Amino acid sequence: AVQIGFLLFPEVQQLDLTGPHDVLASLPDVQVHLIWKEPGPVVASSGLVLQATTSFADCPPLDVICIPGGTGVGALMEDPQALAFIRQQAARARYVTSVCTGSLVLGAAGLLQGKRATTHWAYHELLAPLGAIPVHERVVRDGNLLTGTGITAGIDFALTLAAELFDAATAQRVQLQLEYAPAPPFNAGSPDTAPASVVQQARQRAADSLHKRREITLRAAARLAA
Amino acid sequence: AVQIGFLLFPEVQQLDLTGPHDVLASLPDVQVHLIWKEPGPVVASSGLVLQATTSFADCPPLDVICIPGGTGVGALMEDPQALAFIRQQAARARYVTSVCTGSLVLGAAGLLQGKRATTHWAYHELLAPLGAIPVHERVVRDGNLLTGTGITAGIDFALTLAAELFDAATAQRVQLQLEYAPAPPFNAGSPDTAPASVVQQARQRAADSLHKRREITLRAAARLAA
């Protein structure tokens, strides 16, 4: 059985996780784990309560590890236990992946040094201090590292992983079973296509979080410099 | 506060729910409820454990009700308690919505009689016995009823509901905050675009479920005829 693990942490953006989870759980001969320090409830940023299934110590060696984003990444970027677990699993994983601000966690773990990567548009300036080569694309692949942006990026890259782990016909069958053919009613999903007034409102709402995240990023970068 | 409720039932397709939940929970002055017969754990078809927040009896009058799909709809189509709750809430709701096979539950409740509606492609033949006018489109709107197909339909229609409940700039801001700009790596999300061999594999895998669902549909239609 292919072993796929998602890190599930307090204040996660749950869709970053639940999207790819439902796709990958559709595949044959896969086991999906929701990993935290202990099994039990974990509350997402929206208040939705999820359940971690395994601890760091009990988690089997993973073939795929996926780091979701969300408000809670700031704490994770300075959690030595979580960072050590991610480094241990990434050493042997076939695929290391992240969604949204999850790539900042990979950065704090040292896994982006010299690698092309992306993250959520409002936090993109934080990739370079973590050693990454920042790339403004929706999905960025550097070796076995995939980083993606947007709330379907984990769905979109899960279909890519299905095609490589199995075959293209399997990925297409899953897409058809899920009738996945998105058609958003607006075209404001990127700062390059949204109206300028909307971009301003979004940047203003993220300003305090960005300010705090920069402080955290500099401390995380200092640990990598040692 | 706008009151938004999702029905959460055993064997739900969790992405049908967790997608729109995260979008709508991003809006100001909204309260989101996860409704079942009692608060507590409810297991999705993938094994993911979710938590219902309120019971039928305690649920406030809803402005929006959303019925997700999944394997578990077959039981729901003959659950008199659930069907009565849906009818009660739909009477005064501003928006009645469903995703995927959730529209079959609306059908069993009598809410599709004379209405245009869609459902998952493999079960589309079951709409007519429930009194609906079947429509082969991804999102179908008939008055205050919206039915959608596909794993982002609830995300896509949640942005539409944000624009009507608030304004277009608010919906665009949420889309930008979530960086929602899908780009699937394959184009097999409809039986009209997938390879014929893939369509066959998907239809074969759904055959037993369709056969059972037809029996259930005929019993549900008999109750509507009375």
Ligand SMILES: */C=N\c1ccc([N+](=O)[O-])cc1
């Ligand atoms: C609504 N969930 C759902 C997903 C897939 C299928 N299917 O037949 O493949 C049915 C319902």
Ligand SMILES: */C=N\c1ccc([N+](=O)[O-])cc1
């Ligand atoms: C990855 N989740 C996430 C969603 C939105 C924002 N934002 O700044 O709006 C950041 C992170």
Ligand SMILES: [Cl-]
């Ligand atoms: Cl996206």
Ligand SMILES: [Cl-]
């Ligand atoms: Cl879709």
